[PDB]
């Protein structure tokens, strides 16, 4: 239904995308002995097969099913850090706390982190010139559909206390139309998950106020309360101090 077009608003496929995905797969399987059964060439073939020779506004979650089977990974359900609009500090945290996982510390998340990719209708060519922007061109693009599909499975995997980092400086601390807000929160399984604990990260403001009563936090509390999951909210006033303190536990 999307209009045929050859130029997009977004950045092109990242330079050396095929080589980068293969190298990242090799590196991840070296770090994680429990994933050395993975054939990284086969993973790349499944990844390429998801988006090559398709109009990059007509991508479906089913297109990624071969990649999702090969990238199947058991991740410790009680050691998950979700995040929304604060990837920088979330990744700093799991670099310190190496027994904790964000989505981008899993094989598939690690492969795709900070990369862009798309193909072209009626050719076998990866488009290095431009790729669809989610806002300016179309929602159902290779990158957006990939992150939706892996994020749902990651959220489904969570148990016990799930932590989520949020940016307290933003106009919407919790945005319901974010990936966290529209996919991840709605796939936290009741009973399996005991509690969602929000960590609200503060910015530079001098008039530092309790952000855990913000209407968007009440919105998040309401969503997870209706899933029969307990809600907790923590103000993180000094994220620099938090990241130094986090080393102990």
């Amino acid at each position, epitope marked *: 239904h999307h209009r045929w077009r050859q130029t997009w608003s977004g950045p092109g496929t990242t330079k050396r995308f095929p080589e980068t995905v293969l190298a990242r797969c090799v590196k991840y399987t070296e*770090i994680h*002995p*429990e994933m050395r*059964h993975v054939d990284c060439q086969s993973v790349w073939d499944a990844f390429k097969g998801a988006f090559i020779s398709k109009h990059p506004c007509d991508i479906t979650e089913e297109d990624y099913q071969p990649l999702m089977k090969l990238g199947t990974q*058991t991740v*410790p359900c009680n050691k998950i850090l979700l995040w929304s609009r604060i990837k920088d500090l979330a990744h700093q945290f799991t670099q310190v706390q190496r*027994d904790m996982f964000t989505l981008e510390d899993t094989l598939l998340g690690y492969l795709a982190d900070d990369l862009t990719w798309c193909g072209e209708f009626a050719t076998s060519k990866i488009n290095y010139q431009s790729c669809p922007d989610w806002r300016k061109d179309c929602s159902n693009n290779p990158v957006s559909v990939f992150w939706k599909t892996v994020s749902r499975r990651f959220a489904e995997a969570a148990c016990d206390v799930v932590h989520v980092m949020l940016d307290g400086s933003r106009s919407k601390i919790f945005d319901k139309d974010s990936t966290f807000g529209s996919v991840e929160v709605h796939n936290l399984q009741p*009973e399996k998950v005991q509690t969602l604990e929000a960590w609200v990260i503060h910015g530079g403001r001098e008039d530092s106020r309790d952000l855990c009563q913000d209407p968007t936090i009440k919105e998040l509390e309401s969503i997870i309360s209706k899933r029969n999951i307990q809600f907790s909210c923590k103000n993180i006033y000094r994220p620099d101090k938090f990241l130094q303190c986090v080393k102990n536990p």
Partner: antibody
Amino acid sequence: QVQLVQSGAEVKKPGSSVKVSCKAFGGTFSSYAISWVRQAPGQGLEWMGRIIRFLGIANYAQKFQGRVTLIADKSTNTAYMELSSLRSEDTAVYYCAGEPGERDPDAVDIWGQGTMVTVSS
Amino acid sequence: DIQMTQSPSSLSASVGDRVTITCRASQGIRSWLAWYQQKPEKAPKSLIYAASSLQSGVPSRFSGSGSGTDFTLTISSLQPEDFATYYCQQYNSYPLTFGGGTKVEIKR
């Protein structure tokens, strides 16, 4: 078809140390952690400790802290349990076991065949 | 430590019987309870994880139930290969602790 295979039976004097090996054979070994459990003759199962394979960080039961070392070198396919300062009451079958990693810690889904360790003068 | 208490210590039963054995934790362990089977002079075999989930290859006649403190393993129709000792284990928190076991023996 994957199985955990341990070293054979050991007979040790009090005060000595024993090193028991645990190696995966015959299939995909996707265990997140290796766990160690012992069973004294005619008694129940007792957890000793565990090690996360990708990190090499171990959790120990208080009664084995300072007596037990777990190894799972990332550059080889063999895990080890070394128990030092052996006492007669350490006489037991020692089991290694694999945690799939659905949780940290997790239930074990695979057991080694066991290693009988006799400690006696 | 979380003390795990299994009951009964021994159970006399016949082939075809419905058998239910129980495991109680001294504290809440959510659903983080495993069941293992052991036969004389052999390693344990994994049956159940997360209170109710069967390990791969475990016959459908095995089931598990429980959340919090009180847990159940049920064999719907006992087979000759099911006469054995059964152990529960909490893996909620450290140290990981085992029940004292339930021997399922042949009634005569």
